[model samples]
Target: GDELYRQSLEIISRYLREQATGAKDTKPMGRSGATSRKALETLRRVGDGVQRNHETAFQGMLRKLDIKNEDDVKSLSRVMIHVFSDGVTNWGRIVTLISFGAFVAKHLKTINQESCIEPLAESITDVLVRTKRDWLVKQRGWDGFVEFFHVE
Candidate 1:
């Protein structure tokens, strides 16, 4: 039912790994692949923008959460729900939320909790497909994501 959403998460997760290792790989094939590719491109830019322009603010959020270890990673779904429900929904906000998640993924990798990445992706996918589903659907799903971050 949520194939594209799941695929997008996998693509982004791989993108992060590639970034850390300084390598590139082939994107998936077909229409779903296009959606996932566009998502990765847009999210790469968003993640970079956050690091470049909002590093202080972004770090403040992490500090507030204080996810000190692998055990603390389990609370991420609750945290994401809180953040998502605390504001009016918009594409920019969704982009920021997912971009922040990328940081969490990197944090896990750094702290030798790399196995948690799969479950973490599941948590994020749950929030998007379950919590903000209607808003996402109204925006035409990830098709909307690509359109919102479309470059000309």
Candidate 2:
């Protein structure tokens, strides 16, 4: 099982590397700059919304836990980075949700008591998708329209 997991990680790493290298040479189908600019603008707007949603969800969790400041959630950065990079992988999302839920449970009282972990996990998925879409669009635009070479 350990070997399988390591192999899977290697495969994923190679695939991501290929994608990053291959993306530079790909071009848009038509009207590249305009299309890309539109897509980028749309993604930026959506990204803002997604970020706000994540912050709102985080704040809600904090409120439920009666956490008044960052000192109460000192592990926030580590948790967030772990969730961002590996959350969607097998069982990782559930683990993150449970971890966050436990932290809240250990801290607060007189709150809803019901775990909002599922919603938080869903928010992570949504944010990841939005970010990936934005990255692809921006990469295409940059490669197709802005990265041309001219020799005079």
Candidate 3:
């Protein structure tokens, strides 16, 4: 999981970083999300591509790892955790959001969101904040939604 992602995180971090540097809230997510998706979609479109140059925004990673399913997504969850593992111990909250986003996108068809949220929230609390999800959602607000949507 996170361990697998950990080995690649630095390389992964480069792709998730920005083309244009500035405040994250206002500026678009550089090549981190939309651009990354495009590169991923593009690479997946062509026969095959592992080919990351970093300067090209490094989106080849998805194909490089041959990520193509839910297990792949779960593997990615830890990468998200690492990427979000910065200020304020936001990693766990971010993981919860990733899970939530996955649910919202119907990526988690087999799992019940109703059942997932509580235990997920509790575990996040156990590891991270020791707080309620309502509080987290409120704190995150539009920003959280925006962040989660990007993940989706």
Candidate 4:
């Protein structure tokens, strides 16, 4: 039964591809409408196959890694979130501080430093602005794809 099902799935997938590519007519292949019904059933079974494939792959990978429960997944997710957030925040601060130090260093040697200092200050300001933008983008996560947006 499994082998037959697998064969049917393969044939159905080929048909579906052909249909999608406009390479084959989807009109019923039989006078009694049996072909159309079979095609619909095949499409439904393909959906089941895809779902089963996802479940099996997920379970198999988890089993191989000995991650037995949702708790393990959640814990790993939390660790990744913490690690990413810490890295981004620390990097942003480091860049801002370095830019500020550069601005100070550029002006410290000159007796008439005000004119020379403007460009460095501007550079530092730009760096600060960029850092803030990066922080905001990270907080938003690709513009909040996780949330549903409604348009009126």
Candidate 5:
């Protein structure tokens, strides 16, 4: 059982590693043909951007807000950033994060019923709501909206 688990994980990690690489030169399993090094290089840059480019723009807003590059915010911002990273994943991980955010928001609301936590909690909720809307209503177009969110 453990042996089978290790083999499955190994295959997945190998595929991810390959997605980040190009040419694969000198690796025994390297592609044997004359690969276009420049084309591969460009594609490699694109693959890198698929994660970082959006994060870079978000980092700009954080800087503007002087969000203080502390450990907690950095960790939390990753969650916030991925909400914009094409909405959701197959694992529904973002849903779990928002649910946890809902838990935290409720606690904070009760504690700071008068002030700052209210804004923070509302902002968190607002972003989550907007993220789902953007994906369903804007990015997906009318048809996908009807198919997914508007379905009976």
Candidate 6:
């Protein structure tokens, strides 16, 4: 139902799987073709920063939630809303929240709770686009992320 949610999960799964296997192959595209891969690289960069700078915040919050199953995954929707409201103004902040979701997705994989990844991705995508679609669309969606974080 949500195109963006679908794309986000694809990128998350592809990127993480490649990382786990040490693959350097080109990441698959979503709706944006080459731009999707570029956007993913951007997400990877911001994701690294999210890990470095705010992992503690996300880890503490996720540990408190203690997600273990699909139902438990519902708790994250509220968390996304809270995280989004904490800064209803910045794309960097929006990207930060998405990156944190990636961290959670990776954690889920470690716990063999991969079943929760889709719902979790849906929660983040739904909250983000619902609250910030206008701004996101104005910035040209994933293409804007590529431009914002362009390296060369």
Q: Is candidate 3 or candidate 5 better by lDDT?
A: 5
Give candidate 2 regions above 4 Å deviation. Answer: 1-44, 51-59, 64-67, 89-152
Question: What overall lDDT goes with each candidate model?
Answer: 0.71, 0.36, 0.33, 0.35, 0.36, 0.70
Could you give me the TM-score of model 4 versus the true structure?
0.23
TM-score of each: 0.84, 0.23, 0.25, 0.23, 0.28, 0.80
* CA error at residue 114 for candidate 6, angstroms: 0.7
For candidate 4, write residues 34-68 as lDDT tens digits.
43344334443443344345555444533443433
The count of backbone overlaps in candidate 4 is 0
TM-score of predicted model 1?
A: 0.84
Each model's RMSD to truth, in Å?
2.3, 16.5, 15.4, 27.7, 16.4, 2.9
Model 2 lDDT tens row, 1-152: 23222322222222222222333224442333454444333333333344355666756756654544334444343445554665243222422343343334333322442233223333333333343344434434233322321122
Clashing pairs in 5: none
| Regions of model 4 farther than 4 Å from truth | 1-87, 91-111, 136-152
Runs in model 6 with CA error above 4 Å? 1-30
Off by over 4 Å in 1: 19-22, 25-31
Give candidate 3 misplaced runs (Cα > 4 Å). Answer: 1-55, 87-140, 143-152
Worst 10 residues of 5 by lDDT: 29-38
Question: Pairs clashing in candidate 2?
Answer: none
Give lDDT tens digits, candidate 6, residues 1-152. Answer: 26655665566555555433345656446575666577667877877787789878878977887878878877767767875776556768877777777677777778888776667766777777777777877887777767877777
lDDT of 3 by residue, 1-152 (tens): 23222212222222222111212223333324553444323322221222212313233333343444445444554554454454464434444333333232232233322333233323322333223345444545324433443433
Q: Per-residue error at 28 for model 4, in Å?
A: 80
